């Protein structure tokens, strides 16, 4: 908190309300230096009781990051009962919001998995662990960039605590080891990884349809899920390697990144802005 700021309706433009909102609301703005278009994330501090260590944690984390990969982080700013956390603006929503009108294909999603990968390798590299990976944490501009978001989870290694064991993230995409509170790492990002894959090319993880709280016995005592359907060999293999039980016979992020899936299908980022405009056609026809 030590770079806490204070006055922010000088140097941003409060516009409308866009979303939530881990912690609080999520408003469109201005930075009145640029002209460019920033997120606020507004916290009421008075009501925010149990979740203060969280926030916290994620203005603490976002102030450590430094990479295309995290969604860039403008500064925290106190006014009155509330914290502005002022970030990146990204227009073209989340990965399951593209998800919506329908099916991607392996292209598409060889290169969102590819840019989850560098952020992956970014975070890891720095002992971060995301403990959140899903589509719906992982955010694009409008012109195809994509960035991992929202690290009020996030976990921190040190030289004196070299594993985490906090049960945090959310349940369908969750590593067995976490579920178990065992001592995990970076390795339990990386089967959220997978089940995230699964999510791109099926629509939805594993388990979606039951309620959460059977999931916390299934993902533990059932074998690992695996991608079903007419999927490309490499594409399968990719999630198997991601969901293995033992989580140090799962490959880094590094690694991931030369798998036959990333290399034979991941294309120009600014493709994917045909995913974008698919969404906001889907979105301004619907009822
Ligand atoms: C057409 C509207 N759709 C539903 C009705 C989509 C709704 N969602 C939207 O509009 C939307 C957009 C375009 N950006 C955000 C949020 C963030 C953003 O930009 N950078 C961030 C960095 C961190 C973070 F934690 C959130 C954001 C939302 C909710
Ligand atoms: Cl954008
Ligand atoms: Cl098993």
Not at 56 to 84: A, H, N
Not at 92 to 111: F, M, N, R, V, Y
Not at 210 to 234: A, D, Q
């Amino acid at each position: 908190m030590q770079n806490l700021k204070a006055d922010p309706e000088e140097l941003f433009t409060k516009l409308e309300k866009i979303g939530k909102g881990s912690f609080g609301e999520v408003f469109k703005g201005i930075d009145n230096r640029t002209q460019k278009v920033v997120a606020i994330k507004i916290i009421d501090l008075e009501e925010a009781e149990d979740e203060i260590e969280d926030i916290q944690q994620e203005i603490t984390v976002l102030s450590q990051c430094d990479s295309p990969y995290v969604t860039k982080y403008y500064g925290s700013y106190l006014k009155d009962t509330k914290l502005w956390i002022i970030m990146e603006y990204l227009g073209g929503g989340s990965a399951l919001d593209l998800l919506e009108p329908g099916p991607l294909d392996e292209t598409q999603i060889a290169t969102i998995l590819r840019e989850i990968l560098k952020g992956l390798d970014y975070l890891h590299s720095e002992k971060k662990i995301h403990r959140d990976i899903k589509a719906a944490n992982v955010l694009l501009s409008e012109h195809g960039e994509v960035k991992l978001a929202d690290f009020g989870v996030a976990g921190q290694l040190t030289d004196t605590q070299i594993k985490r064991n906090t049960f945090v993230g959310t349940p369908f995409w969750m590593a067995p080891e976490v579920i178990k509170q065992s001592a995990y790492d970076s390795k339990a990002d990386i089967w959220s990884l997978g089940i995230t894959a699964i999510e791109l090319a099926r629509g939805e993880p594993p388990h979606s349809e039951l309620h959460p709280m059977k999931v916390l016995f299934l993902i533990p005592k059932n074998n690992p899920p695996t991608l079903e359907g007419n999927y490309s060999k490499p594409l399968k293999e990719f999630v198997e390697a991601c969901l293995n039980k033992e989580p140090s016979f799962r490959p880094t992020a590094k690694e991931l990144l030369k798998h036959k899936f990333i290399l034979r299908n991941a294309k120009k980022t600014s493709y994917l802005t045909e995913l974008i405009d698919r969404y906001k056609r889907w979105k301004a026809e619907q009822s």
